[PDB]
Amino acid sequence: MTNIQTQLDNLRKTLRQYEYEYHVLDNPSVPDSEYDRLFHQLKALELEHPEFLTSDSPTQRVGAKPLSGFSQIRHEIPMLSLDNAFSDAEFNAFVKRIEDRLILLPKPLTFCCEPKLDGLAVSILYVNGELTQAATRGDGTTGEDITANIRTIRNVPLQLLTDNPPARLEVRGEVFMPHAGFERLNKYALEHNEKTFANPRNAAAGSLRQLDPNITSKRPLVLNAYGIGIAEGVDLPTTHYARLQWLKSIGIPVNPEIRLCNGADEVLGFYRDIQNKRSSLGYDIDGTVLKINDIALQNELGFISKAPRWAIAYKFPA
Amino acid sequence: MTNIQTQLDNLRKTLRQYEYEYHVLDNPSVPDSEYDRLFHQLKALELEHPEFLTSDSPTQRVGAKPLSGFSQIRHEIPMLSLDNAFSDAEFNAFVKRIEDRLILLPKPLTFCCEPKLDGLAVSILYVNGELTQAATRGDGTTGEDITANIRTIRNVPLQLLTDNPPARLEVRGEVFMPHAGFERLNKYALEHNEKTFANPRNAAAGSLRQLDPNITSKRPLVLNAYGIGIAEGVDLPTTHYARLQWLKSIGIPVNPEIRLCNGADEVLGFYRDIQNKRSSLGYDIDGTVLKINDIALQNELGFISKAPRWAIAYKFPA
Numbered sequence: 001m002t003n004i005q006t007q008l009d010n011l012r013k014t015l016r017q018y019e020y021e022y023h024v025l026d027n028p029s030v031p032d033s034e035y036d037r038l039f040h041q042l043k044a045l046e047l048e049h050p051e052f053l054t055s056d057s058p059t060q061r062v063g064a065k066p067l068s069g070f071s072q073i074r075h076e077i078p079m080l081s082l083d084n085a086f087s088d089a090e091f092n093a094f095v096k097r098i099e100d101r102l103i104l105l106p107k108p109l110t111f112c113c114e115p116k117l118d119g120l121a122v123s124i125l126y127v128n129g130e131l132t133q134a135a136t137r138g139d140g141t142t143g144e145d146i147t148a149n150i151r152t153i154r155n156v157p158l159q160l161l162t163d164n165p166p167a168r169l170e171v172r173g174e175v176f177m178p179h180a181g182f183e184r185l186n187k188y189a190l191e192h193n194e195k196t197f198a199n200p201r202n203a204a205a206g207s208l209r210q211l212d213p214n215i216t217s218k219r220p221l222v223l224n225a226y227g228i229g230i231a232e233g234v235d236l237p238t239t240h241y242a243r244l245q246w247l248k249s250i251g252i253p254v255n256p257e258i259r260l261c262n263g264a265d266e267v268l269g270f271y272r273d274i275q276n277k278r279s280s281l282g283y284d285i286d287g288t289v290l291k292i293n294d295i296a297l298q299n300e301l302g303f304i305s306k307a308p309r310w311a312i313a314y315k316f317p318a
Numbered sequence: 319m320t321n322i323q324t325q326l327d328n329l330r331k332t333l334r335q336y337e338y339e340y341h342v343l344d345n346p347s348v349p350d351s352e353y354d355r356l357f358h359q360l361k362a363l364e365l366e367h368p369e370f371l372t373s374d375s376p377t378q379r380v381g382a383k384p385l386s387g388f389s390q391i392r393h394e395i396p397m398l399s400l401d402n403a404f405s406d407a408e409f410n411a412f413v414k415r416i417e418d419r420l421i422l423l424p425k426p427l428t429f430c431c432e433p434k435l436d437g438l439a440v441s442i443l444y445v446n447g448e449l450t451q452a453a454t455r456g457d458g459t460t461g462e463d464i465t466a467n468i469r470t471i472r473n474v475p476l477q478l479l480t481d482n483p484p485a486r487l488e489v490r491g492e493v494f495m496p497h498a499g500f501e502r503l504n505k506y507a508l509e510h511n512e513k514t515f516a517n518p519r520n521a522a523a524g525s526l527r528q529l530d531p532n533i534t535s536k537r538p539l540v541l542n543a544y545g546i547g548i549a550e551g552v553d554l555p556t557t558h559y560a561r562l563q564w565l566k567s568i569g570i571p572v573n574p575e576i577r578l579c580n581g582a583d584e585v586l587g588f589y590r591d592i593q594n595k596r597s598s599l600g601y602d603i604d605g606t607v608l609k610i611n612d613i614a615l616q617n618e619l620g621f622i623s624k625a626p627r628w629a630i631a632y633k634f635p636a
């Protein structure tokens with residue numbers, strides 16, 4: 001044991017906890033200045049004693065070197081797409097269909113309802129709690145390695161906040177740029193004669209395809225996690241909402257507008273509530289994602305491969 | 319001009335026309351013996367005058383050499399999958415959803431209704447009327463080159479029956495083995511101590527993965543065409559049924575049980591009619607494929623990429 005190893009370990013733990021309070025809980029226990037005081041003390045100490053510098057320390061989010069290009073990543077589990085609806089009657093038809101298709105329809109049928117963010121879909125792998133790899137969705141099968149860019153995102157933890165992290169955990173979600181950051185970036189680009197962005201979605205996509213993480217780091221990007229891919233060495237909750245609460249409890253940012261709704265009429269109330277809230281959120285949303293909350297019912301329902309909306313195979317019973 | 323070139327040209331035309339009457343129309347104008355008399359006269363003449371032998375002649379369906387292996391074919395247009403239903407209420411929900419999702423719902427909403435064959439999905443390319451390539455569906459993106467095996471199928475024309483074939487035409491359909499052939503094959507395999515097949519679907523799949531076309535040729539395989547892929551140098555009909563009638567009119571086999579039905583209740587009548595007919599068809603069917611007949615309505619509805627049945631994105635209107 002040495003005093004400087006202990007000071008480093010204490011500063012790192014303290015800083016990860018404050019980043020959690022600030023970014024995930026939206027309830028910081030100390031002022032921004034106090035966080036910075038400790039951050040730059042950690043940074044100086046690590047540079048004065050480099051033998052003790054760690055790759056997942058809060059000070060190591062930004063690579064000092066711009067990349068030459070992006071490698072490809074074939075996802076182990078494919079990143080699927082989402083069906084869509086444009087009316088209450090259409091949503092009601094989707095529910096009526098699940099009601100008939102299920103062996104046993106429960107009373108109530110609970111949905112996990114979320115706002116649909118307007119950003120870039122990503123997959124982030126944590127190995128024994130440490131962020132090791134991140135990829136874009138791409139076509140759902142293969143994407144680009146954006147690990148160095150994802151590491152710059154302030155609300156993305158480099159280490160999971162648990163003493164018993166899973167062996168492997170892949171977090172799925174959306175990277176977006178809130179309104180305030182987007183307006184600041186466009187003002188800056190105008191004041192320093194550069195390319196302005198038409199909308200927050202374009203600003204987030206453009207920021208994530210930067211080969212220099214030093215540029216990505218200056219872009220006000222945020223992650224909201226909405227799912228899990230690989231999950232080894234853990235018993236994941238049996239409802240979708242509980243899995244999201246579990247990600248939030250181990251350091252991963254999740255949207256605070258997510259609710260449970262029993263039946264189609266409550267879900268439509270959520271849709272309407274979120275639709276009126278649109279003007280006050282501070283980031284863009286295209287709609288709402290409504291998911292069957294029970295994982296066993298999701299597994300029973302399964303998925304539909306790339307197919308027409310204009311055809312169906314009415315199969316005969318045995 | 320020579321008398322033998324003219325005799326060859328006349329025999330070939332006559333034989334293709336009789337194969338059409340026999341296989342597509344199910345209305346042969348001559349006995350089987352008359353067809354064979356002309357077939358073996360053509361075959362002897364071609365062997366006596368090999369300079370005039372053509373690769374698409376009715377006598378050249380079977381390659382004399384077994385293949386070493388199967389090459390891969392990436393489809394130019396992906397081969398999609400089909401959504402499914404297991405009840406009237408579920409089918410009715412699928413229709414209710416199309417009714418709401420369409421800009422303008424026509425009165426009536428016409429469906430092209432077909433039996434769902436229980437075979438192997440294939441893609442067959444004709445270049446200026448000549449069969450040049452055939453592939454299995456595989457995963458919908460890449461499949462295997464089974465040209466030599468597809469050429470052995472008696473009801474598959476090596477040449478389209480039209481003087482103005484399209485520049486390129488890809489026919490999509492199912493290869494299956496009728497009951498009579500399946501029962502004969504299993505009796506033969508038992509009488510010559512060999513592998514028997516559990517069902518016609520397995521017998522068709524196993525027959526198409528034979529590297530020796532001489533073995534495939536002895537398997538009683540049939541094609542029923544249900545769609546079009548590539549279509550260059552032609553104005554395809556604007557309804558699905560008319561496209562199928564057009565394939566039938568240029569030499570391609572299509573199922574005779576296909577009908578047009580106006581609205582969900584007529585479609586369910588078709589489903590019931592086909593369900594009672596099951597015991598009398600002479601080949602296996604899993605259900606019925608019900609498709610929106612108007613191509614512009616299909617195009618408007620589009621497709622759903624690989625997605626869950628347990629989630630939906632209810633999008634906000636502009």
Ligand SMILES: Cc1ccc(Cn2cc(C(N)=O)ccc2=O)c(C)c1
Nearest residue numbers: 018019022028030031032033035036
């Ligand atoms: C100078 C400075 C330092 C920190 C922050 C924001 N912030 C605050 C905390 C905190 N309060 O625990 C933790 C992480 C973080 O990123 C800003 C905007 C500016």
Ligand SMILES: Cc1ccc(Cn2cc(C(N)=O)ccc2=O)c(C)c1
Nearest residue numbers: 336337340346348349350351353354
């Ligand atoms: C010996 C023999 C010859 C032909 C056939 C069947 N058949 C008949 C015709 C025909 N009638 O125009 C055309 C093609 C064809 O395949 C069988 C079963 C047996």
Ligand SMILES: Cc1c[n+]2nc(N)[nH]c2nc1OC(C)C
Nearest residue numbers: 080081082114115116226289629
């Ligand atoms: C593509 C996608 C996008 N989103 N967005 C949310 N909120 N959830 C969600 N889930 C998705 O996909 C899973 C349902 C497969």
Ligand SMILES: Cc1c[n+]2nc(N)[nH]c2nc1OC(C)C
Nearest residue numbers: 311398399400432433434544607
């Ligand atoms: C896979 C498939 C299978 N089947 N079978 C029939 N009869 N039609 C049909 N259409 C298909 O696909 C298109 C609708 C894309």
